[PDB]
Design a protein around this nucleic acid. Structure first.
Length: 267
RNA sequence: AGCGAAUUCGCUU
RNA sequence: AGCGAAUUCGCUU
């Protein structure tokens, strides 16, 4: 049975106006990164008019366009794709035919990003992963490029249901020795040692300002829980204590649009 | 919001 | 005890 491949085109057609950017966020147009999402089906999708999803960066115009048709894929590849589909929905969005990542081939043309899919699996299988065994002899090294397009997860808590953040900002003028915002501790270093028995090997590293990855399911329409949402983004994280998720933030922002997009496609 | 914990209250004739 | 409902409190830096 032959396959159809669609590109979910995303373009930030109306960026958020400054007078609505209350949380003072940087705006990330999807068209600035080549990697994106696509749909693999066994039957065609009828022509569907361009429509808006309303995201944190503003209004993004969605278009479904055919990339490829009449090809076959091996059992193995179909299996892999099926796994990543499920991964995207269960593990990234946490929800309850195939969505898959596209990218440009070395030459403008979008195709199935197999290498990325294999990288995710490798990461998940704990294959090809750098050390997190930091000591005085082999200390944590902060690399600014690894915290550009990053989603991060504090390792040291919530083993069951890890919370996820975009790096909102890198505070180059803070370090683990900076003063802690709560009186009961003098520094970040003291906090994590006291609260979690975590040692730090790099005391000059920047700290991170975060912004929680959303959960807002329906983006087809525009715009206790008050105390939390407040405090939530006031958190400041230490790089050495946080994992970088194998999914880049650029793609994560596109992924949270999927449920609205698939909802619209089912009509 | 979520996960915990306590307190008060409502239902059976 | 079970099922509801409200009130107070605790956790993330």
């Amino acid at each position: 049975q032959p396959c159809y491949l669609y590109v979910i085109g995303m373009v930030l057609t109306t960026p958020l106006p400054d007078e609505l950017n209350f949380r003072r966020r940087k705006l990330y147009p999807p068209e600035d990164t080549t990697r994106c999402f696509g749909i693999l089906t066994a039957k065609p999708i009828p022509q569907i008019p361009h429509f808006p999803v309303y995201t944190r960066s503003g209004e993004v115009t969605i278009s479904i366009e055919l990339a490829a048709s009449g090809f076959m894929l091996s059992l193995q590849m179909l299996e892999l794709i099926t796994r990543l589909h499920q991964y995207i929905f269960s593990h990234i969005l946490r929800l309850e035919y195939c969505v898959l990542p596209l990218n440009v081939v070395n030459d403008s043309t979008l195709d199935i990003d197999f290498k990325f899919m294999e990288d995710i699996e490798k990461s998940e299988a704990r294959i090809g992963i750098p050390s997190t065994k930091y000591t005085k002899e082999t200390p944590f090294v902060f690399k600014l490029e690894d915290y550009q397009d990053a989603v991060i997860i504090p390792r040291y808590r919530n083993f069951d249901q890890p919370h996820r953040f975009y790096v909102a900002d890198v505070y180059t003028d803070l370090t683990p020795l900076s003063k802690f915002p709560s009186p009961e501790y003098e520094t970040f270093a003291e906090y994590y040692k006291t609260k979690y028995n975590l040692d730090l090997t790099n005391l000059n590293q920047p700290l991170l300002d975060v912004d929680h990855t959303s959960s807002r399911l329906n983006l087809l329409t525009p715009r206790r829980k008050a105390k939390w949402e407040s405090l939530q983004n006031k958190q400041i994280l230490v790089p050495e204590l946080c994992a970088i998720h194998p999914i880049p933030a650029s793609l994560w922002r596109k992924a949270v649009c999927l449920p609205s997009i698939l909802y619209r496609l089912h009509c």
